Symmetry: C2
């Protein structure tokens, strides 16, 4: 009866994983290339490369692919996050400003680069998706709530990651 409060925590993790899976698939549909596994997506968005490419996808006037830093993520795979990656996240923010996505949905650079608040970044991706679908500039993001499943392991990992 109190362990159910523990299940609630499990449900919250599960739900979030579905929204990550949805964001993942949508970006892959837009970019025409694969993104990391749903379970590693958050860490995989930190260097801002995918977000910058997404930025080019709907606002090519503001986001130049050749101006993206570590566009192939070679620097990232070798060493880790580099301050310069921060500009990628900034190009994405600028792209969204250009197309008119209301400011309220924007995460801050630190929220994604320093992973201070990745969920805020995922929710923003979902709002951008809805806004883009509105303007007929991108396909509709999918609704995988109860369609997809994850292992116990994956849910636990997300659960404790979500906690502290």
């Amino acid at each position: 009866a109190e362990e159910m409060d523990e299940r609630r925590r499990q449900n919250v993790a599960y739900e979030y994983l579905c929204h990550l899976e949805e964001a993942k698939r949508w970006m892959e549909a837009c970019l025409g290339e694969d993104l990391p596994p749903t379970t590693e997506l958050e860490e995989g968005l930190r260097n801002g490369v995918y977000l910058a490419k997404l930025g080019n996808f709907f606002s090519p006037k503001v986001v130049s692919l050749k101006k993206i830093y570590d566009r192939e993520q070679t620097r990232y795979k070798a060493t880790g996050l580099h301050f310069r990656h921060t500009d990628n996240v900034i190009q994405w923010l600028n792209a969204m400003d250009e197309i008119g996505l209301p400011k309220i949905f924007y995460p801050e650079t630190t929220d994604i680069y320093d992973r201070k608040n990745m969920p805020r970044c995922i929710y923003c991706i979902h709002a951008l998706s809805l806004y883009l679908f509105c303007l007929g500039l991108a396909p509709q993001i999918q609704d995988l709530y109860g369609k997809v499943d994850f292992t116990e392991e994956e849910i636990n990992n997300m659960k404790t990651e979500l906690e502290k």
Copy 2:
């Protein structure tokens, strides 16, 4: 220099106040009636009455005005929040489900009734606004970011309310 963090926290509060002001004005435009002062809006949405009315505004097929509990908020002004008010929030959620607003934006009833996460409800109001504007079912929410001002006291109250 260390004082920088304080200005930041202040900015976050200021920003949020602007989005509350935007949500406030938009709902008033939709409902044709006044809502509480921007500084008291969050507390003023708790009984779910305004949200249910908003629900009727874009989904009259799902939300009948005559089925809203304490519609005139007479009970609310007299006594305080009452459990039945919870149904009002639920009607709003159902209204949004009916028009197809993606579930990811939905706060839980406890988030607004128990005020467990009011910002989550304001965020969803903005997502709903964008969506509705898209379907031509409502006017566009305005961008008041730097057009609206608040007292130091107000920004401060929101700041500490946002922290602890």
